Amino acid sequence: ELQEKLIAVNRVSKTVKGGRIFSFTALTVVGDGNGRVGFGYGKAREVPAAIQKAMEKARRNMINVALNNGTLQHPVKGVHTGSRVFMQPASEGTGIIAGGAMRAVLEVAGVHNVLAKAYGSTNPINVVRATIDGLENMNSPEMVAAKRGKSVEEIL
Amino acid sequence: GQKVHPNGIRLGIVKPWNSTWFANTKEFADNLDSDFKVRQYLTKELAKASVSRIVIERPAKSIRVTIHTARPGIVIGKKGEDVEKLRKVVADIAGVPAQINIAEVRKPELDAKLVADSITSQLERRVMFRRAMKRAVQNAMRLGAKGIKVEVSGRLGGAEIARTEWYREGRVPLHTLRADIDYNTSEAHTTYGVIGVKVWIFKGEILGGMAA
């Protein structure tokens, strides 16, 4: 059902009185592949435990996105602490035009055609949050018509 | 040195001895020399067989070695011929006639010597130490052991500098003297030196001391 995927693994350190003790961090993106997406950032003493730690949190912290049939509704921009993302709906056959930690999360989410661009610091940890906020803040024609008070054909 | 051997700290409380007899030191030295010889001969012979432990009793003008093993069939043989074959050598090494007993050990993955064994074989056949130790500890926890602690040290994975890794599950009260802390050692002779393995298996709290 889900399309869980690990993005990248990082090795952190922490000095103590006896010395330095290492640790591992894992970032994962999960989703049903149709309209849902979620991210998980876990940390553990070892790579195999950290990936599962990230996966569980990603599974239980998913976000539903009101996407189009194969793309996203309208072009959007998301702003985070250090990463800015711009996503534009492309046509059929283009593919997931993205890079870094954006193409994986976009393919897991369900979209198949989108032009994505990253501005600022292109770190995965911030860019994942930026690209999920960009999909969370956008709305559908039905959703905007609901608050407008008119019909989709009227607000075409 | 940090830790004392957990067997000979509770041998007088909860743990049994591996050699039960008496001497007035007129023959004590030769008795242990004989015990050492028979133990090393048995260890060298029953290599494929997973021998759990070797207890020795020495009554008057006779001996009785009660080997405990996980797979007794290999030592037994068809129609009990192999035991008769390997009994005469023990009898003539010890002088007095022998009577070898064999005891099957239930739950072969819950014995300290057995779990310390075959991990050296995995290292010899180049099985990763981390996954080997993880499988051993998880199998021991699943079988019913309340606590397992496995340490592996020395030239792990054929690196350049030796280290010491360890895993632990449940609880291993090494300081208490009212629990089964069955512990044994083993070594692996790899292509780049020797690797030491230690295993502690806490099963339960034996109330009342010795004799149940």
Add this chain to the structure above:
Amino acid sequence: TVSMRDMLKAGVHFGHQTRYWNPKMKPFIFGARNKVHIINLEKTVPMFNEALAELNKIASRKGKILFVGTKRAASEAVKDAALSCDQFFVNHRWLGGMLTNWKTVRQSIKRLKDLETQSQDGTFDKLTKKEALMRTRELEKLENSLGGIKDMGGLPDALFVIDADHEHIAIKEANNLGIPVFAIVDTNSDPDGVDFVIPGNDDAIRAVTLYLGAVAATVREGRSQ
């Protein structure tokens, strides 16, 4: 029961001074009297009736409710109301991670049977008094906090907070899970994380008893089949 007149003589007027009022409480507060904000019953009552209706709507069907009123004076009233209405409650310090950390508090809940065997059976008969005293002391300490939720088993369905500013910890754990909360707030509280807001006094001895009686009556009337 829910009449406007009874609350006036019970005392709901004085909630807190005008220096502690929360800025986003303007609509519920009618005015200021003696530098003390006074709540208005004309809007206190209809929202309380709506909350009671929605709560008995869940009470009629299956669902467990919590009664978080962990005050220094309302503890006995909360316990009595919960015992009368045959529901669960907590009458001591709210253990952080009681709902979001159920995976670990279930062990504590399940450990006042095999650990209370020292008191109900003694093992043999109060075995090893020297450690039996420690065993019974820890047993008492363990259920002192969670004695009212020992029969739950599963996660609750609805929440009732008496002090929605003093017990924001419970509200924080309820919000990320997604269970309705019919909380009563004061003039110094935040109606942001709570799902149903009941403005009015909560630290008065008589007002809390009146609210507990009303909620017990509605929950035992919704489920009376």
Add this chain to the structure above:
RNA sequence: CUGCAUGGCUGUCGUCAGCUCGUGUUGUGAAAUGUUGGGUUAAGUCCCGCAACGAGCGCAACCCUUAUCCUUUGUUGCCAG
């Protein structure tokens, strides 16, 4: 010969009292709470308070000797009559 490849064993901090983990929470994140604060102690011993809830290695106890009394059995050990 290489303890600057090691296994095993051992000394030191120190018989100091700290060292960590699971879940939860907080901060994007290194990380923090838990382990701090108040009494208390030989002590992370206990209590209270507190986004903490529990557990493991640990601090103690169980183990050995001795300090009183009772009982079982008196030779090679003792002499109330």
Add this chain to the structure above:
RNA sequence: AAGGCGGCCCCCUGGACGAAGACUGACGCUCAGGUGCGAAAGCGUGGGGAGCAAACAGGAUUAGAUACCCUGGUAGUCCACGCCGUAAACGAUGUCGACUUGGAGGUUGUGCCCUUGAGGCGUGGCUUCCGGAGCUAACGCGUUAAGUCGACCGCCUGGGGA
């Protein structure tokens, strides 16, 4: 306005705020060049010089001490007219407009209430602390925003070399 300003009195004068009243009718904001002011230190002229104190003399610690410490001590610090225009000239935050939850104050007006106490209810000007939303890499800002804008000027584009 900034620099900055502390006994008292007199003389001349700039600036700010409030109660009520009428007109002038966009006359309004910013500003490259330009001008003016501009801490202290510094220089020229003519004086003054109690204390303090660069330079300098002696003593002392230190292996050495051209310093920190001690005893003296010149310029300077002071006055008037002149010259430079430098500072962590700091709120490291350029001027103005309006919008966007609160609490505790400080100073200074003003309306009304029995002013029995620095009694209360409103409204203005300046300023301090805490803090919500929001912003920021974080610290932190937070109605005197570092929150969302509008008008203008200046500056930044790797560290040294500079």
Add this chain to the structure above:
RNA sequence: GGCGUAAAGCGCACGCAGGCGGUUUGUUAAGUCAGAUGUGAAAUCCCCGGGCUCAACCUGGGAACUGCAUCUGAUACUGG
């Protein structure tokens, strides 16, 4: 894109040229908006077809050449 702390608010104030500018009406229509004409060479790019056995290559038509000048109107905004 930024100027509190990484580089970035002149030390401050006045002010010329310049930049912008509260609110209503009428007028002009300069910018702006609509339509038309001429021109914006051929060549080149793109789209639809053809010829070289395919392609490179050549070629027909269309579109485009984002611009300028003139004429005829629109008056909300900026401008007089």
